[PDB]
Amino acid sequence: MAFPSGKVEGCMVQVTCGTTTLNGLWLDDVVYCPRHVICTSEDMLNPNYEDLLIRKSNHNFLVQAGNVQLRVIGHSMQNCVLKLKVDTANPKTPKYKFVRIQPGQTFSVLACYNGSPSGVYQCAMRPNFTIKGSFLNGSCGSVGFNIDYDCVSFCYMHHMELPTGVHAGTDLEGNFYGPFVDRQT
Ligand SMILES: *[C@H](O)[C@H](C[C@@H]1CCNC1=O)NC(=O)[C@H](CC(C)C)NC(=O)OCc1ccccc1
């Protein structure tokens, strides 16, 4: 059984850089999202993320909370996630923590597209660090979480689909679960 999603729905935004759009997680005044948002389609083959990072400015990122655009005032990279500092703190930020889960553990996923929540379901982390998700194009940045009383424990951010149809992603510090890397290879 999935957890109720209301506390997490209020944290989802859309992030666009160039023609790449995915989802971000807005907590306090930081938006967390997968770093491959800064890739064009050609970059995705063998990205040099350090080089792409230098060439971006704050105004290259478009962050929207529904119809409201949020101004980006800084950005940094932490492992495989980008952290965009915005000028507005999310007034719906729940009590939360970032946790790294173990194979065998379950968590709920709020699947989102264009910054808008679409569905909620339960997943399990397999021994090879993959999950059998229901993720389509545009789902990157969707998060996995558990609820402990009133505290939302975020444990997964979605990045990619593997050839066999299963899914891989990172914790919220941007470290992959398993030996994968964020390149379309
Ligand atoms: C981000 O929205 C997207 C999610 C994928 C697309 C298909 N289903 C998903 O879960 N991720 C990517 O496009 C990712 C980007 C790299 C720079 C990591 N590449 C990826 O998952 O491989 C391309 C692919 C597309 C469709 C089916 C299988 C693989």
Numbering used by the authors: 6 to 190
Task: Quote the study on this structure.
In Severe Acute Respiratory Syndrome CoronaVirus 2 (SARS-CoV-2) and its closely related SARS-CoV, a single copy of the main protease (MPro, nsp5) encoded within the polyprotein (pp) 1a and 1ab mediates its self-cleavage (autoprocessing) at its termini (nsp4/nsp5 and nsp5/nsp6) and other cleavages between nsp6 and nsp16. The fully active mature MPro is a homodimer, with one active site per monomer, and exhibits a monomer-dimer dissociation constant (Kdimer) in the low micromolar range. The active site consists of a Cys145-His41 catalytic dyad. Domains I (residues 8–101) and II (residues 102–184) exhibit a chymotrypsin-like fold, and domain III (residues 201–306), comprises a cluster of five alpha-helices connected to domain II by a long loop (residues 185–200).
